Every structure is written in C-alpha cells, then in structure tokens.
Amino acid sequence: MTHDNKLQVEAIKRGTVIDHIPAQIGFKLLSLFKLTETDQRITIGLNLPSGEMGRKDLIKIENTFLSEDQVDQLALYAPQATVNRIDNYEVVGKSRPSLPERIDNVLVCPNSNCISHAEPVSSSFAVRKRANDIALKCKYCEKEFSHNVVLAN
Amino acid sequence: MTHDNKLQVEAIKRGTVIDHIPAQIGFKLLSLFKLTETDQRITIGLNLPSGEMGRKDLIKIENTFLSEDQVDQLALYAPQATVNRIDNYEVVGKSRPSLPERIDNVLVCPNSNCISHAEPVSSSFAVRKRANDIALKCKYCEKEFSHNVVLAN
Amino acid sequence: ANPLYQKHIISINDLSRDDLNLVLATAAKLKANPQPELLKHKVIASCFFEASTRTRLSFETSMHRLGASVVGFSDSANTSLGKKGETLADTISVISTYVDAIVMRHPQEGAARLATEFSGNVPVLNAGDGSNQHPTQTLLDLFTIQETQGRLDNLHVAMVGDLKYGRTVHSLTQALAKFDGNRFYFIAPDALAMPQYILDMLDEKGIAWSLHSSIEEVMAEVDILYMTRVQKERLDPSEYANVKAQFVLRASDLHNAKANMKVLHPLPRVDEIATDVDKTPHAWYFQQAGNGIFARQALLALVLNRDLVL
Amino acid sequence: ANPLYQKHIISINDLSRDDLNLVLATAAKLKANPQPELLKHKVIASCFFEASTRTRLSFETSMHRLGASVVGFSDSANTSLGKKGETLADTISVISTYVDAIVMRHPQEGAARLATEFSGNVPVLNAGDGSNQHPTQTLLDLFTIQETQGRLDNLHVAMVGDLKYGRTVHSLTQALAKFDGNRFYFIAPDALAMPQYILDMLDEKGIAWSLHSSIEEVMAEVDILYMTRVQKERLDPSEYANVKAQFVLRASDLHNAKANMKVLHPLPRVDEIATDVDKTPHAWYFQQAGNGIFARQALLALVLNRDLVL
Amino acid sequence: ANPLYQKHIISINDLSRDDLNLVLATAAKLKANPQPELLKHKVIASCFFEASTRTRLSFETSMHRLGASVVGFSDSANTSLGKKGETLADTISVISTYVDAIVMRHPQEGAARLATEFSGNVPVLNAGDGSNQHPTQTLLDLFTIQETQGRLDNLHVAMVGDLKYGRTVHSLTQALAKFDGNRFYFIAPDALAMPQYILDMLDEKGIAWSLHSSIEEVMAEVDILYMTRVQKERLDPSEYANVKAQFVLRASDLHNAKANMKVLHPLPRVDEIATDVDKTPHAWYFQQAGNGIFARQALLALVLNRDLVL
Amino acid sequence: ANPLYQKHIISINDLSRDDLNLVLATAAKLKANPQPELLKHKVIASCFFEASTRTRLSFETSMHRLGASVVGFSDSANTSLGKKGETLADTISVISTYVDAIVMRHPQEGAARLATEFSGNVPVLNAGDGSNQHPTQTLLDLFTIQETQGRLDNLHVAMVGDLKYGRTVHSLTQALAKFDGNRFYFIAPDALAMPQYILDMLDEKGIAWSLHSSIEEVMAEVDILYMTRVQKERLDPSEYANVKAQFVLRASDLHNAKANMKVLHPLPRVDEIATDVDKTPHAWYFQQAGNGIFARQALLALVLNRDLVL
Numbered sequence A, B: 001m002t003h004d005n006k007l008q009v010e011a012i013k014r015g016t017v018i019d020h021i022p023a024q025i026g027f028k029l030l031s032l033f034k035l036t037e038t039d040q041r042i043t044i045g046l047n048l049p050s051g052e053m054g055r056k057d058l059i060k061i062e063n064t065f066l067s068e069d070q071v072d073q074l075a076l077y078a079p080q081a082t083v084n085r086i087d088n089y090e091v092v093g094k095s096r097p098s099l100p101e102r103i104d105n106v107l108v109c110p111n112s113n114c115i116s117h118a119e120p121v122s123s124s125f126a127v128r129k130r131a132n133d134i135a136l137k138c139k140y141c142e143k144e145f146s147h148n149v150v151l152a153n
Numbered sequence C, D, E, F: 001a002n003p004l005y006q007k008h009i010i011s012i013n014d015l016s017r018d019d020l021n022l023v024l025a026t027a028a029k030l031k032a033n034p035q036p037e038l039l040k041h042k043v044i045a046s047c048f049f050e051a052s053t054r055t056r057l058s059f060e061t062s063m064h065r066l067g068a069s070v071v072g073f074s075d076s077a078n079t080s081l082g083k084k085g086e087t088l089a090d091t092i093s094v095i096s097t098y099v100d101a102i103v104m105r106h107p108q109e110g111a112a113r114l115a116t117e118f119s120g121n122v123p124v125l126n127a128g129d130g131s132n133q134h135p136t137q138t139l140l141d142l143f144t145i146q147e148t149q150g151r152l153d154n155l156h157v158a159m160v161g162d163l164k165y166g167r168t169v170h171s172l173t174q175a176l177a178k179f180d181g182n183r184f185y186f187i188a189p190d191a192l193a194m195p196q197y198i199l200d201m202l203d204e205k206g207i208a209w210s211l212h213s214s215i216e217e218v219m220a221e222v223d224i225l226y227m228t229r230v231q232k233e234r235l236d237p238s239e240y241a242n243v244k245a246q247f248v249l250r251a252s253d254l255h256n257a258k259a260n261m262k263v264l265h266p267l268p269r270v271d272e273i274a275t276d277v278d279k280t281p282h283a284w285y286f287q288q289a290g291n292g293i294f295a296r297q298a299l300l301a302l303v304l305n306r307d308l309v310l
C-alpha cells in the first residue's frame, strides 16, 4: 500500500447504472427521458476518462430499475455503452445498446405539417437501418427521414 | 459524531463549486444556465441531504472560476446557497447569491404580444420586491409581471 | 297534447320547472330507447344566420336520429355580405312556409323571438340569438349534471372563468336557482366576476353563494365544476396572461375531489383545462357534449309530437 | 364479423391483399345489386376540414345510396379563419359522440390517424390527409382497372404526368405492386420523375419497370394509361409550357392502342387530355369517377355492416 | 450638441424632467420662427408597420416643414398581411443602412426598442408600439397644456373615459407626475378604472388624486379636461349603453367652467364629445392636434441637429 | 454626354463590359462625394405595379439623396387587384407625359421593355419584371463585391441555394462571365441545380465551374459566398426538410475562411443564414444591401445627367 496518484470515486450503491456516453451527450439523456422527475439518487458527472480516446460520460441512480427493453428506446444516443443493473450491493445485469422497433416522445417528424405539432400526442416514428444512416417513418405523416435530419430543428 | 454521518458529499480537485440547492430545483439550473455546454469535468449529486439535511441538488465543477454576476443571477431558484472558490480542496474564498439587478437570456415575457418572442434578441427583465412577489418588467414589452407568473412556464 | 307541443323555445327564463323536468325526462328516455322514426316526414330548417358548426352538427344530428329531413344554411361572413337586402322578418315569413320547424341561430339578440311573430304555427327553436339566450346549451348542461349527480336539487356548483360575459352561465345559474338546496361558488377574476343581477336573484330566492380567488378553496366541496373559456380580448395580453394560467384547471388539482364530482365545459377550450384532465374520471365535458344530442333531440320530439310516452 | 368491420381506413399501405379484394368484391356486387337500405339508421359526419366538393359529393352520394343520413361541413378558407380555437383531437373527441362514422378530409398529413385515437369505437375514413394518403381514390382507381381489364395481375400500366408530387400515383403503384405480373411505364419530365423510394420498392419485389420520354413509345404496349394533371406552379410558365403540351394526350395518339386499353385520370384535368379523347373508346376517366361511388359505397358497408354477402 | 442629439426616443419614461422642458421650448420656438431647411438633405423613414394615417400625416407633415425628405409605407407590405415575412431585426438592419432617421409605428410592445439595438447610429422614434409607448401623443398633449395654461404644475387635471386601457392617459399621468402641485381627478366607469400601478406611483410621490362617477362633480375647478373614448367592444353592447352615463361631454355642462379651462382629446372622437362643444372656447382637441406638428417637429430637430438655435 | 445619358435600363444583358465599369466608378464616387442636387427639379415615377416595399425604399431613398422628387404607388391600384383596368401601354403613355423618368417593377416578364416603346424620351428603369430582369440587384451585388474584393476578375465565387429559379443568381453569373479568371462553384439541391443554358454559356467562354453538395467542400478558397433561400413551396414540405442539409450557412462553418471572404444575400433571408453569422466579419448581405443605394443612385445620375462629374 502507498504508491502514487489520486481519486475520490469508485463503484457505489445499488440501482440501475450507465456505462459510456459521448461528450455533451451526457446531459441529454437526462432532460430527454425525464431522469429527474423524482426523488432518488440521480448523482452523476461528465467528461471523465474511463477507457476511450478522449471523453466519456457515466450515470448513477438507485432504487430505479430500467425496463429490460426501455434500454432499447434509449439506445441510438450513446452508440456503444452498458447498463449493468445493480441489484443488492454489486454487479448483476450486463446490457447493451440495441435498436428499438420505435422511439416515442423524443423526436419530431421534421415536416412542418406532419399533424402532430399543435396536437396533444406522442411523436412515434419507426427505426430502420441500411448503411449511410438510419431511417424512421413518421407514424402520423408517414414521411421517412434519416436520424440526422430528425436530430435537430 | 461516530453515530450518524454520510458516505457522499466530497471536496476534490481545483474548481469553484456550490452548496445547498432546493430539491428538484437544481437540474433546472444546469440547463437554464448553459452549464454542461462545455467539455470540462463535473460530478453531480441530486436528492443529497447536505450538512443541512433539507434535500438539495448539488454540482462539482472543475477549473471554472465562478463570479459575482452569474452568481447573483442564481437566487430566485436556490436563494440560499453558496459558492466557495476552490483550488484543490482549497476554500480560497466564497460568497452568496445576492439578488441581481437585471436578468437576461433565461426568462420569458408572459406577454403573448411582447416583441421579444419571434426576434433575434436576448430576454431581459428587471428585479424588485413586494410583500410576497418579485416584480419583473419585460425590458421590451415594458409590462411588469410576477416572478411566479413567469417561472410557471 | 304534451305541455310543450307546437310551442317555441326562445329564452330559458320562460320555462316552468315542470317544463324542464319534462324535456330532461324525455331526454334520458330517448337516450334509453332510440326512436329513429318518430319524426319521419318532417322537414326542419337548420338556419344559421350566425355560423356555429359545432352547434349545427349537434342539432342537425338530433334532427336525423329522429327520421326527420334537414335543409338549411350557415350564412357566415362570406354569405353575410348583405346588411340590407332581406329583413329577418321577411326571411322568416318566407322560410316559414316550406318547413315544419325552424332551428335558427343569430348574431343578434331578439331574433328567435322576432321570428316567432312571423312563422305562423311553424315552431322556432333559438340556437343562440346574440348574447341573449341559447336554451339548447343550458338544457344539455343540466341534463349532464342530473344524470351524473342523480338530482338537480341540493348540490354544490362551481362556476369558473369569464363569469361576466358568459351567458351559458347566467342561463344555467338561473335554471339551477329553480331548484332547492344548492350552494354556488364563483371563482372568476375581479374584472369578470359574476354580475350583480345574478347575485341578487340568488339573494332573493335565498340561495347560498360565496366568491373565491381560486378553485383550490372550494375544490374539496364541489359536485359540479363548470369551466368556461376566458378570452384574451376581454382584457389584454399582459392582464390576461397575468391571470390566465391562474384560473386554469390541471390534473394535479383534483387530488381532493369527490368521486361523484364532474368537470364541465360548454367548449371549446384551449387553456382553461389542461390536457391531463381529459383522463381523470371527473372529465365529463365531452359526455356533456354528446348529451346535447338528447337535449336537442328531446326538444324537437316534444314540440313536434302531439303526445309522447316512450 | 367481415374482416373489415368497425375498422379504420387510413393509409393504403396497411391493407392486406385479401383486404383489398374484399372491398373490390363488395364494390362490383353493390354495383350489381343496389341495396339502398343497408345503412338505414346510421348517421355519418362528412367532415371536410380541407374543402374538396368533388370528393364530398362522391362520398356523400354513397352515404345516401345506402339509406344512411349525412351531416357535416366544408370548413374552407372563409371557415378556416381560426388557427388556434379548437384542436383537431378535441373536435374529433366531440364529434365522435354524435355520429356512427367519420369521413374526414384534412389539409394536413396524419389527421385521419390522429382522429382514430380520439373517436372511441367510431370509425374514421381518411379522404385525404395532406399529401399523405387518400385510400378512397386508389380503390376506385383499382376497381376501374380490374373491371375493365378483368384482373389486376400481369398488366402493363402507364403513369403520365407529375409523378413526383402525385400521391394518387405513389398509392396506386404501391397497391399494384401487391399483385403478380405487371410491368410499369413512367413517362414524366425529368424534374417530376417517379421518386426513388417507389422505384426501389419495385426493385425489391422484382417488378418490371422502365422510363420513357413520351407515351408514344409504350403506347402500343399498355393496358392502362394513367394521366395526371401537371401544374404550372410545380415549375415556371416557360419551363412548364416548354413541356406542358408535350406530355399531353390527344386523340391522334391512340391509333395503336389496344381495344381493351383504357385512359384514366383522377381528375380534374385541363391540359393533360385533349377534349377529342373523351369520345374514343379508351376514355374511362369518367367511368373511373362514377366507380368511386361503389368503392366508397362498398367501404362504408363493410366497416358498418357486421356481415355482408350480397 | 444638445442632450438628445442622436439619442433614441422610445418611452415617455426615458425622459428626464429637464428634457421635456427642452423639447417644449424648442417646439414653441419653431412655432414662432419656423426653420424649413433645419433638416434639409436629411432623409427620414416614416415606417408604419402598424398602419395609422392620422399619426402618419401629422408626423410626415412635421417632417416636410423642415426640408427633410420622406420615404416609407403604411399597413403590412413586404412581410404580408399578418404572417411570415422576415424579422423586424432584419428590416431595421436593411433600412437603417440608407436613412438618416427612423420613425416607426408598430403593433407589438417593444418594436421601437428592439429596433434601437439594430439601427446602428440611426435614431429611432417610436410612433406607438402596441399597448406600450407612444411618446409623441403625451408630448404633443403636454405642449398644448403648457400653452393654454402657461404652466405644467399646480394644476387640476381631469381624465374621463376608458382609463384602464387608455395608452395615452397613463403616460400623460406619468409625465405630469414629474411636476409639482398637480391635482388629479379621475372619472371613469368602474369596469375601466385607472390602473392601480398608477395610483401607487401617485401616492408614493405625494400627488393628489380623487375618483368620480360624473364630470359634473369636479367640473368646477378643472383647468384641463382630458376626454377619451371607450370603444363599444370594450364592453357588452348593452353594458356600454347603461353606464354610458356622463362619460361623454356635452356643452350644457360647461357654465361654471373656468375660463382658462380647455378640453383635450387624442382623437378620433366618436360619441364622448358632442358637436356643440366645438363652438365654445374650451374645445382644444383640435388645436391640441395641430400642436403635435411642433412637438414631433421639435424632436426631429433635437435628435438630428446639435447646435439647435431657434 | 455619357454612354447612358437618356438610355433605358432593362436587362443585365443590355450592358457592355465597359458600361458596368462606368456605373460602378460613378457609384463609388457618390459614396465619397455625395451630390444632393445632382437630380434637383427632376421628378421620377416610382411605379410598383408589382408591390415590393424593400426595393421601393432602397430605390426611392436612392432618389431623394439626389434632390429628385418622387411620386408613385405600390400594389395594384387604378387597374384593380388582379383583373381588368387598362393596358400597361396606355398607363405608360399617360404617366410618361408628366415625369422625367420611370422606375417600374412589374410581375410579368417584359413590362419594362414594353413600356420603353411607349415612354417617348422618358427613360424606364426595370425594378424586376417577373422571372426576367432585375438589373439593380445584379448591379448592387457586383459593386459590393468590387468593394470587398477590390476586383471582379480572378475570383472564386460560390452560389448556394435555389439556383434553378434564382432570378438574381443567373444574371449575376451572366455578368461576372463578362470578366476574366473567375472560378465558379455552384452548391445546390439537384432538384434545383443551375440551369443548363448558364453552364453552356460558361463553357463556351472557357469559364471554370464545379458543382457541390455541401458548402464545406469549397468553403476553403472562396472569396465570395452568395447565399440564397429556397422557399418551402419550391419543394414538398418534407422534401425540403430532408435535403435542407448544408444549404443554410451557420457560423461554425467559417474557420478556414479566407479573411477577405464575404457572405452576400439579396434578402429577405429566412433560414439559410443563421444569426450568429451576423457577428463575424464576413456577413455583408447587409452592407451589400445599403450599397444598392449607390448603384441605383448612380444609375439615376448617369441616365438623367450627361456631363456627370463627381
């Protein structure tokens, strides 16, 4: 014991937890999926190294366990990452970012019409991949776009 | 003090950080005050009972000296909170959030006709105290509203 | 034969209690056992000198569910290009000779009444003559309260919104004041409060009533919550805004409401009632709508059928 | 009972082949033996938030030929003076409580679908939600091709005009691609050519298709010639003109067409098809119209009748 | 250089007590010794985003009289009739690149102010922005007062009409507040009383004001009577009639009227001021009206010229 | 007398290489030593058959600054709102009988030209005629370029946006063609590429041009970037969104930007040019905008005065 370097953190308490998130992409997942509409430990931190070429973000909640699929509906944003639900004091569930059939309430049929705008409804699309990008079909307007165009205003 | 204490609530590395911020009234601050909008390191702790217990949100910034101005503008939400200028667990200073004089870019004129809306300008108001309210005058629309009237949205 | 045969439906004011109970009675009965051919062979003018589609459809549907045929118009703003090329009277006189009944709506007060004196024995039903009456709305309001509350007597009613210019209201409150028990609550801003003449009329029949600043006070003690849309033009952007999202109703506010309690709105809304309400069990503003079909359907039957008994 | 009872008719995309054949089957049967009382006692809202009289009449006629009653509106440009005083959803919710079915047309894409989630068990039939669907047109197109060609399989179809912005087309070509055989020909200018996604979808089911510059090439080998109106505003006076009277169809051009071959047009025309065609025997664009009555009539029967068998 | 050379003119508030004085002296000085070339070779932009003839002619006239060239537009133009067109930001950016001054009227509070942060060193003068500021009215009023009373202090001012929405009143009672010994008597229907915010400012300054129901009450000692009109739409058509009591002046109510007394009114006037009044020597709404050619005239001078010697 | 004294100004084509030079020198000469009485006692007719504020103020402002008196009208007047009124022939005949010059904008290609054969010796200056000529834009653009680049030859010009319909682009790439060593990089959605006719002229002159999909590609060596907007209506609302890729500049895309480089745009601008750009030192769409007061100013001079010494 007694080498040379400093730290303050490590693997803490229970709850579902997150591994690997690009930069400036961290905060996103929070506001976007309403990750504070509660009272549980939602402690986190951004821009800290954990194994990558420059940056990486991680998350930490307890008492709340992700839907063994909701996981999916979360994918896309953090290309590659992990969950690893923490049921009772230690590791207990390795998951990975796989594409959902759909993704609701988070996007916007970038079609100035595509009805859902002044209307009280959840924006539902449709995931589809190929090569140069990812496509999704406006559930309401039936107009398809690439995840890029949809990801912006 | 061996009786009761707390595992979290640290004090690591050079960086100006806060302390004691209302419950479920801190996340709202990260966004509102274009914080994450940088590629620096920061730990966060929400639903954390401080050395004051009253459930609060809390940050932890790295090398980003904080100042009086952007400081004053932190009241309203977390009136009573603190900003001690650290240099590696070094309280080389501090202060408190005294209610600012102005308050631009972050609020919204409740005036449906306030010109501010559709145009390329920064929202600017005015601060003043009443029995229970906080008077704010849409700098453009020139109308005065109640602080709770503007924050509701 | 029936009390209301061949008779006009103009102002809510002139309706006996027996009168009302009759229409309602019919309503719930016509609701129960739908008689699609009662009015077979009758023709009815759906005259809308003042466009109100929402209303036209509602009315016109009852005209249909009863085997009656309909013909009319919705002379709007691109139809009402003529301020002096046909007096109402003359129109009523003419139109009075084709049909069996006249359901008319008008931009101006007094119209329905007037048409009456120029329609021979042909019946006229006011769908809203200016800012005066619109008995048709009041009745479905009622019908809706009774069926949800089992009675129209001894009830706590809340009235929220632009109480000053909301006729629908004045009308309802008057009708209600035709029953015993009943305690009223009017939570409307100061420049849109309930009018004095209404208060007095309640002062007279010795009717319970108090004012409030927000529905939260009373919310715990109300059976009926009647929401009305306020309008920005009845004030000014700042003013309105500075109170708009104040007398609005949202889901969180029903945490202490009675199981039986129901929320109402003559519609259309926009602000007054947050979308998240539409799901609670107190939201009856839509059931309130579809019910206007049995109020308006019932009325035509009574007026056009000599004797009705299910 | 029947596959399509109490069900919505939104996008052509979501219709099984069995689905289609059913409607068509009904169509030609309802055409053969007219049943004016099947829909006796039903009320149907002919809602046109986006005016299309030509369409309204067509639909509304089927509603009538079946003993059903109709009430609705054509909220045009002097009715749509309100951009924020009634959400569609709320309207659908309300209107959903009076009628048995809703035939609605809308300026905006997604509308029909949306209305679906706010109409309870009341059925909605999209008459054209923006630039998206309008299944109703596609079906009469079809119906018309089949009855004239005896089949919808193994056919040569020509598609002329503004192939790029013509939904009617996209829709039809998709439907057709639901049958075997069939070779396609798209003769449309370069800036209005058929879209890639359509081509690909035909690439996928391995469907025969080639492009041409003028109908003359293919004219000799087509069973169906589908004309669509181009518009000057999709280009510019010179541009358009410099090609307008180029992809037009005139009588002289049918000298080598098949007896069975028929010319079609969703209408209205103006240029695309010279008047002198209207007389040849290949002109079926009008028969194509009257046929929309048995497509739309058939649809309402299926959706509203529990079990149908002529 | 004077305290206003090159400064903007937006709010009546943004004016110091000492300022108003400069503007006024100036104005009178131009009424005695008119300077037709003062603003020679200067080009101003009379911009009327919010169309309003009256204020346009007054302003532009009080623009030619100084040899200044004018250019501009009324009602909505390059940006539509009430839709999409481009930011005001972008307009001011462009226009301020070729004029030596901007005079703009707009329908939303803060347009002049917003413009100011986009005109570079080109001055902007607010011709009223929605329900916010209209500096020339308040100023042209004052001057008029100053001229018929000789002073703007130790005076009895009466204000009749709609004071709750009276844009021009508020700022007028804000400005006079910047003076000593002024006594205020407000006369208006309760539905439309003087805003609280104003009273609060009146008291926190030791200023004396009293409210009335009828002009007659204070008619006795008033030096200035300021009439305003309450458009019908500011109250139920019938509400209006009822309390349209004495809130409209009539010559018969001017016997014990102080000789020096003057009747003022922004205009246009509808009912509030009877014709017969026009004869008596108190009517000044007109003379007040032509006075604003000197106030606005003075402003342009002050702002565009520095060593303003007149 | 100069080569343009008393000549008409219709097409950008009708301008010799040597001509443009005169106009420009002139323009700069008026920017240094302004001549307020150059056009004193001259009356011009600012005629806007095709209403367009922007170009009207620019033009008229660049009319008063020369002591010229103005008179005219925007939108359709004496001849309706888009119907019958009288020939343009007859209008020009009448008006040219009392003005010393005509500046007209019209909606149909060739109005200025037609007018020219009817104004007698009264000059006519085209302010854009439908999709044909708009000489002042192309000229005010050039000057701006000439001013920020010091030359109009041996330059890299980029043009982004709708180039298939861009009236102002075409003539701009026509004019610059009249110069040496210019390299062109066109960036636009295929649906709206640069017309062929233009390329053909570019090659038959040895001019170098290349096409791109993204601004970034050529961003490196461009001295001038010319932004334009593609109004939604130029493409399916959804089409637009999809490829609305980089065809709208954003400050983030200006690091390896040549210091001398300038961003230009006729305006108005909607989306294509983000606000943050306005800060950087490349944004010149505005300065370019106020420059057109000198181009148009120069023109009036050249055409109305002969021994033009400035």
Ligand SMILES: [Zn+2]
Pocket (backbone or CB within 6 Å): A108, A109, A110, A111, A114, A115, A116, A138, A139, A140, A141, D110
């Ligand atoms: Zn969508």
Ligand SMILES: [Zn+2]
Pocket (backbone or CB within 6 Å): B109, B114, B115, B116, B137, B138, B139, B140, B141, B142, B143, E110
């Ligand atoms: Zn403001």
